[PDB]
Amino acid sequence: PLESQYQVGPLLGSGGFGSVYSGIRVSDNLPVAIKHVEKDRISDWGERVPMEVVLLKKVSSGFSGVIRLLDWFERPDSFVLILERPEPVQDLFDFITERGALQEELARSFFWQVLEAVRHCHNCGVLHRDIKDENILIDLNRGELKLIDFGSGALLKDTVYTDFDGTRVYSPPEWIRYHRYHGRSAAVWSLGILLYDMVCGDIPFEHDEEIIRGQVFFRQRVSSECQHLIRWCLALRPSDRPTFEEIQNHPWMQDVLLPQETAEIHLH
Ligand SMILES: O=C(O)c1cccc2c(-c3ccccc3)c(-c3ccccc3)[nH]c12
């Protein structure tokens, strides 16, 4: 059974993704996250399993940048997912809420790790579709970030997407205006929103009209090179956006700290 092999803890949270509980694997006391998703709330299926599970199995590996699915169960009206849980841990949203705008050295480290994680997914045929601070977990001890919540994701394809159920304020202007986007360039856009969030302590755009206007105003002191990378990711024309390679070869991205140095300087 399920409740046999996992000691269920307190509710960590709930929302569009379902309900997440803290847990521990009974055998070896491994900290786990127990995610309950209602069958009525799932729109994407087929291996018949939720897309999220397909996606999670596809990206599973020893690479600690993407969250690992440890196991999954089916129930009459729901699926239960047992995922890795770092400890101690904080999501990027809470982390930014506490500390405000991040020092460029830390934002570089964090951003680099998100890029490696997203490249990993794309390399495995997976498009996340909801990259944002709330979907990034920080292993506070190792200084390692984890991408979570593949519940809005899809198989990566080269043709247009006309469905979207990620986060509107991280969605590109081509989704807003036309309900059409392509996977890579839409991901780059959300990465630009994310970097801005990291260095300014909040997202650049709130309303649809700001997204489509795409004018970036900096509310905090941010280096010329970081502003350039940001504005590049946030190019209105999808084809004007950098590739993942171009982002990582950007002058601002050079001399990244290791996760363990990042934790030493900034987390410990
Ligand atoms: O959704 C996953 O794939 C997932 C995968 C792994 C972990 C999580 C945690 C999580 C977050 C903080 C601390 C511990 C677990 C959450 C979460 C999301 C919103 C509110 C509360 C929890 N979701 C996951």
Beta bridge pairs of residue 146: 137
CB–CB of 82/33 below 8 Å?
yes
Give the Cβ contact number of residue 162 at 10 Å.
10
The architecture CATH gives domain 88-268: Orthogonal Bundle (1.10)
Nearest Cα residue to atom 18 of ligand 1? 13
CA pair distance 155, 161, nearest whole angstrom: 11
Are 35 and 17 within 8 A, CB to CB? yes
Residue nearest ligand 1's atom 20 by CA: 13
Beta carbon of 17 within 6 Å of any ligand 1 atom: yes
Select the CATH number that applies to the domain covering 1-87 from these four: 3.30.450.20, 3.40.50.10860, 3.40.50.300, 3.30.200.20.
Answer: 3.30.200.20
Task: Provide the 8-state DSSP code for 133.
Answer: G
Contact between 91 and 38 (Cβ < 8 Å) = no
**Atom 3 of ligand 1, residue of closest alpha carbon:** 149
DSSP bridge partners of 147: 66, 136
| 127 in contact with ligand 1, CB cutoff 6 A | no
Look up residue 69 and give its two tokens. 């699915």
Residues of the chain with CATH 3.30.200.20: 1-87
The answer, yes or no, to whether any atom of ligand 1 lies below 6 A from the CB of 12, is yes
Parts of the chain belonging to CATH 1.10.510.10: 88-268
Contact 69, 53 (CB under 8 A): yes
Provide the resolution (angstroms). 2.4
Residue nearest to atom 14 of ligand 1 (CA): 85
DSSP summary character for residue 263: I
Identify the three-state secondary structure at position 71.
strand
Residue in 12, 80, 144 to alter for ligand 1 test, most ligand atoms within 8 A of Cβ: 12
What is the C-alpha to C-alpha distance for residues 95 and 86, in angstroms, rounded to an integer? 15
67 lines ligand 1 (CB under 6 A): yes
Contact status, residue 127 vs residue 187, Cβ threshold 8 Å: yes
Cα dist from 187 to 61, 158, 194, 242, 262, whole Å: 22, 13, 10, 11, 25
- Kindly give the distance from the C-alpha atom of residue 19 to the centroid of ligand 1, in angstroms, as a whole number: 9
Q: Report whether 216 contacts 204 (CB < 8 A).
A: yes
The Cα 185–Cα 121 span in angstroms is 14
Q: Is 130 a catalytic residue?
A: yes
Q: In ligand 1, which atom is closest to the CA atom of 148?
A: 3
Q: Where are the beta strands (DSSP E) in the chain?
A: 6-15, 18-25, 31-38, 69-74, 78-84, 89-91, 126-127, 136-139, 144-147, 154-155
